[PDB]
Design a protein around this ligand. Structure first.
Ligand SMILES: Nc1nc2c(ncn2[C@@H]2O[C@H](COP(=O)(O)OP(=O)(O)OP(=O)(O)O)[C@@H](O)[C@H]2O)c(=O)[nH]1
Ligand SMILES: [Mg+2]
Lengths: 41, 165
């Protein structure tokens, strides 16, 4: 699911950010990635 | 004062339940957490920012993105889940090997003590091999999220750790 190094870097920076919008973005990003992986089954 | 807490453990251990029992004082419904929940809990003049991170196996690789700056780890275990206690140990030790957590203190919650055949805190200590941890301040507390028993005792320990530097 999280093999794409570039997407991982985006996720890592959002999760380590002090900006509340970044944290909301990360949380949604993780759900999207899991959901897309659920698709393709 | 402030303390950044990372709360992890296998899926279904009771983490989100604990987070909202602390934050809101009640048991609320949950779904398996895909991502995280984060809430700040004010206790003993310390603002504990608690990161409740999902434990489904598919997302455990993400735990590493939350290690940076963590001051206290709360590792929550389903005390009734004998089938997965070793799996919990494996995840706990894999996380503790990380340099980013070298200075983090460890609070283990032996959760779901309300269940008839729940393992006690001493048994969970033995099964997780906590006595073998080196260069780490750690504590284990039996908890029941519903009643709240053990939860604040856990925060008390964390609080004393922070106070003593
Ligand atoms: N009997 C009992 N059940 C509990 C207790 N705490 C939580 N639960 C139940 O355990 C199940 C999982 O609880 P969650 O809080 O969603 O677990 P989680 O650790 O957040 O799981 P993930 O989000 O997958 O990481 C739920 O059905 C809760 O009702 C407890 O102290 N006793
Ligand atoms: Mg959860």
């Amino acid at each position: 699911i999280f093999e794409d190094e570039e997407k991982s870097k985006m996720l890592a920076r959002l999760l380590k950010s002090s900006h509340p919008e970044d944290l909301r973005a990360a949380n949604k990003l993780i759900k999207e990635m899991v959901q897309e992986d659920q698709k393709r089954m | 004062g402030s303390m950044r807490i990372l709360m992890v453990g296998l899926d279904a251990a009771g983490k989100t339940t604990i987070l909202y029992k602390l934050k809101l004082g009640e048991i609320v419904t949950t779904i398996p957490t895909i991502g995280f929940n984060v809430e700040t809990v004010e206790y003993k003049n310390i603002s504990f920012t608690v990161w409740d991170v999902g434990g489904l196996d598919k997302i455990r690789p993400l735990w590493r993105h939350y290690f940076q700056n963590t001051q206290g780890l709360i590792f929550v275990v389903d005390s009734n889940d004998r089938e997965r206690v070793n799996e919990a140990r494996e995840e706990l030790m894999r996380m503790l090997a990380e340099d980013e957590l070298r200075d983090a203190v460890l609070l283990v919650f032996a959760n779901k003590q309300d269940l008839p055949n729940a393992m006690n805190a001493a048994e969970i200590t033995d099964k997780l091999g906590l006595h073998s941890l080196r260069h780490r301040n750690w504590y284990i507390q039996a908890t029941c999220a519903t009643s709240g028993d053990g939860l604040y005792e856990g925060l008390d320990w964390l609080s004393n750790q922070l106070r003593n530097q």
